[PDB]
Design a protein around this nucleic acid. Structure first.
Lengths: 62, 32, 58, 199, 131, 55, 68, 53, 51
RNA sequence: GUUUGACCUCAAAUCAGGUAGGAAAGCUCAAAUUUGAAAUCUGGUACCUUCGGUGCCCGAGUUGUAAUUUGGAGAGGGCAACUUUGGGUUUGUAAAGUGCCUUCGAAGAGUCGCUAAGUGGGUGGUCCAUCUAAAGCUAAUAGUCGAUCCUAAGAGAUGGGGAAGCUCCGUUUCAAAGGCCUGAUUUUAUGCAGGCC
RNA sequence: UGAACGCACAUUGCGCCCCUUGGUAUUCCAGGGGGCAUGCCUGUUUGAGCGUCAUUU
């Protein structure tokens, strides 16, 4: 039984009091592709009608 | 001309060697 | 003659032996070492014997 | 159902490799890279190595332009910096010029650095496996650097480098030289240790 | 230099280090696509020997091809041809062997981009830009 | 060293003619197994340019 | 009867090398100031003399005269 | 093939400090910044003297 | 957790500051009693710093 | 420090610029540190004398981009009172060449033959002869009637896999497969936080 | 129209984005102009991952 604070002191000397982790419990059921910035393009350089049997259009405009 | 032939002439095939004296002398004279 | 048959450099042998000591042994070489303790083939067995002798003392 | 859709394939493979890293029985040459410097020794090593950080492109250009402007109108000591680059440091080690060599432990083609601890020990060059290849690049002004080295040091820091070498010899070399040559990675999980070690 | 050590180490493919690395890497490869892009060469020394430069316009693709002469021709040729068909804007420079299974052989193919100015403006490599 | 456990005695070597550290000392823990932990974590500590020697 | 996980034996690295691997002579560029930097400095000098590069003093002068 | 201005100034300084003593110009740490052999110093100084007088 | 270096640094710096204060106090005591014979300086200087 | 930040891998954009479909002569890399200084390069931008140049800036790159070297060797030094010089005006103690002296002096592996070697190896000759592989370049009359819309049996892209390939299988499959809502503007000070299917 | 490129096509069918013009016109309708295929490369910007790390003066 090497006390209880001796183990903590050894861990702090060796590891350095940066162990604990922060994570979120409610995760998403399905992973989707995240939305990212979609920039716009910025280029560098640039009456009654009928069809007649002879292939033309005839329009009666009253 | 072998490297020895060119060197003996005062200044070309690197694969050929010199083993005959008459041919070496003839080539040296030809270079000169 | 050509350089390709000159000799083995000190650095070259050093590198080869260091890689030999680091990489380990292939399974058939482990089998050969086990057999020995209990032209290609001659060279391989001589290499194994050299490894054994170097592992013993030096 | 099919809940696997909560992880993309790359995340799943990325974690499967992590599991395989600790479950597989790794050979000693690859196992030695899990033994790195502790917090204090690593923090003290990067205090010396951060004082010899090479000049960036902008600083070097400014220094050269000042000299050029001085010349255009009308005897220096040798510089000191940390040596990097794999081939350069390897050439330094086998010439016995490096005083201390830091080797990163997370080189993705691990075979690029597997021979380095052995070469450093064989050639009598102090070495240390330092956790983080991105941290060695900060003192090099690169994103990553596989290795770093100290060949020459300013006379003010000569004692500090010797003390650091002795500290690494006591903390890293003499401490791990027996377990360095043992196969690692035989960690047993709870569901497996419960049924094998107990039974 | 460090490339001599890598070349001497890669000559022992059944040693503990390489056998372990290949066992892990072949499983990792089998999880990716048949033809995928490598971030960087797995054997940089072999890439340097075969003519690879760490500059813009040099690409590496990993490809796996099934083995055997039965069907219920070289494997390297098929691998290189599939890689070249995938990247039709590049020329297949070379390729080398990285891994193999009882089912697949794995190759890494070095390609060059002819349209990149880093390849067009240097005389040592602009020969491949000719049609 | 009180963070590694309860202490019972802490003494430091000094010069008699002038009070000045002799750079070594002794100290005793109430728990014997606390001394082992205090020794394993500070036996090669690089502090202020010194390699602490705890045994 | 064969251990597949036997500890590594350092039969080669246990003997320290006393002296370097090769006897290549030391180049003269490691003892004298840099030559590449000398050429680069002279190139910058030539660019300054042609007015292509404004010297840092003149640049410092131009940024204290407009931004008002 | 003519020398440059900076080389001429360097040879000026060498000649004015040592004269024709090439062994001292070889071992001078302030004027022979790029440590150069006695032969190179002699050749360049002879060219400078021939051009000037 | 309190690291050893923090404690050592605090002790060293506070020891330096304490000696500074003791020196200043002894000098002011010497000047107050008009015993300015073996003191470094007896003048009350003021330094004005301006950009 | 339950914080903050470096990298690594993998993604997306009608992102910037590109690319594919179809019909008689010899030489160059890799392999040995520029370490007294990544000396190297794409791109954006502004001017210019525009198949390009310069300045500035963001990046690539040390897990290696330049200079030097390729057995015909080659390299680092030293000595000749040795020889030579680019670009549309040259110049930098810059780049080379010849002779002699001195110190050094790498060499392509799932490859040769299941799987190697370094006075090694390949091929020939009745011990000798000859070359230097496993890298590369190189000339000679309709809003109102129907279609248009919807899905039916089925066919068939994408994801993925096979095949030398023309192409084939498989139809929701170990795919990052897309829409919507809320909020004093988001607590070390104005770089998006949370939620639903 | 065709390798044929917004999606389809045995239809001469169905969409989306930006700018601009005209009719009662901030909402409606129409006209005009310019864009929206895939694989790959280099770069830019925006991201995901308890993948590796560091994190007390």
């Amino acid at each position: 039984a090497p006390s209880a604070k001796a183990t903590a002191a050894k861990k702090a000397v060796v590891k350095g009091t940066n162990g604990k982790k922060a994570l979120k419990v409610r995760t998403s059921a399905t992973f989707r592709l995240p939305k990212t910035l979609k920039l716009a393009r910025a280029p560098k350089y640039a009456v009654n009608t009928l069809v007649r049997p002879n292939g033309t259009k005839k329009a009666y405009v009253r | 001309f072998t490297l020895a032939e060119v060197k003996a002439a005062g200044l070309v095939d690197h694969r050929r060697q010199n083993r005959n004296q008459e041919i070496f002398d003839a080539n040296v004279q030809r270079l000169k | 003659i050509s350089y390709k048959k000159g000799a083995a450099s000190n650095r070259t042998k050093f590198v080869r032996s260091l890689v030999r000591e680091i990489a380990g042994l292939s399974p058939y070489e482990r089998r050969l070492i086990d057999l020995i303790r209990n032209t290609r083939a001659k060279a391989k067995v001589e290499e194994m014997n050299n490894i054994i002798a170097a592992s013993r003392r030096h | 159902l099919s809940r696997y859709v909560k992880w993309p394939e790359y995340v799943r493979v990325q974690r499967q490799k992590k599991i395989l890293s600790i479950r597989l029985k790794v050979p000693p040459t690859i196992a030695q890279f899990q033994y790195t410097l502790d917090r204090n020794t690593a923090a003290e090593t990067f205090k010396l190595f951060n004082k010899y950080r090479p000049e960036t492109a902008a600083e070097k250009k400014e220094r050269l332009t000042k000299e050029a402007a001085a010349v255009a109108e009308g005897a220096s000591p040798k510089p000191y910096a940390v040596k990097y680059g794999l081939n350069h440091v390897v050439a330094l080690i086998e010439n016995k010029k490096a005083k201390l060599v830091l080797i990163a432990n997370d080189v993705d083609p691990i075979e690029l650095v597997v021979f380095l601890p052995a070469l450093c020990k064989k050639m009598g060059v102090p070495y240390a496996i330092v956790k983080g290849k991105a941290r060695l690049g900060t003192l090099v002004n690169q994103k990553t650097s596989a290795v770093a080295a100290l060949t020459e040091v300013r006379a003010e820091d000569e004692a500090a480098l010797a003390k650091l070498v002795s500290t690494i010899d006591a903390n890293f070399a003499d401490k791990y030289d027996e377990v360095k040559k043992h196969w690692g990675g035989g960690i047993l999980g709870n569901k497996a240790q419960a049924k094998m070690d107990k039974r | 230099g460090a490339y001599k050590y890598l070349e001497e180490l890669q000559r022992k493919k059944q040693s503990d280090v390489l056998r372990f690395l290949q066992r892990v890497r072949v499983w990792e490869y089998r999880q990716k696509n048949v033809i995928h892009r490598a971030a960087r060469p797995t054997r940089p020394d072999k890439a340097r020997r075969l003519g690879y430069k760490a500059k813009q316009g040099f690409v590496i693709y990993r490809v796996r091809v099934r083995r055997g002469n039965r069907k219920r021709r070289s494997l390297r040729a098929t691998a290189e041809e599939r890689v070249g068909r995938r990247a039709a804007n590049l020329r297949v420079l070379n390729s080398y062997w990285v891994n193999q299974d009882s089912t697949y052989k794995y190759f890494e193919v070095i390609l060059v981009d002819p349209q990149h100015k880093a390849i067009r403006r240097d005389a040592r490599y602009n020969w491949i830009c000719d049609p | 060293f009180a963070q590694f456990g309860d202490l019972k005695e802490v003494r430091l070597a000094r010069n008699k003619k002038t009070g000045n550290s002799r750079h070594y000392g002794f100290l005793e823990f109430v728990n014997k197994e606390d001394a082992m932990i205090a020794q394993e974590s500070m036996n090669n500590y690089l502090l202020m340019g010194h390699l602490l020697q705890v045994r | 009867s064969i251990n597949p996980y036997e500890p590594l034996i350092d039969w080669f690295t246990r003997h320290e090398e006393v002296m370097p691997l090769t006897a290549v002579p030391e180049p003269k560029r490691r003892f004298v100031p840099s030559k590449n930097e000398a050429k680069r400095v002279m190139k910058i000098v030539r660019a300054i003399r042609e007015g292509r590069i404004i010297p840092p003093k003149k640049l410092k002068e131009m940024k204290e005269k407009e931004k008002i | 093939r003519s020398q440059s201005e900076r080389e001429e100034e360097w040879l000026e300084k060498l000649y004015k400090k040592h004269g024709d003593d090439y062994k001292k110009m070889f071992f001078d740490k302030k004027l022979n910044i790029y440590q150069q052999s006695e032969g190179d110093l002699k050749r360049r100084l002879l060219r400078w003297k021939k051009r000037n007088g | 957790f309190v690291r050893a270096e923090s404690i050592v640094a605090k002790t060293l710096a506070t020891s330096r500051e304490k000696e500074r204060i003791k020196r200043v106090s002894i000098l002011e005591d010497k000047k107050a009693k008009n015993e300015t014979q073996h003191i470094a300086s007896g003048k009350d200087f003021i330094l004005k710093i301006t950009e």
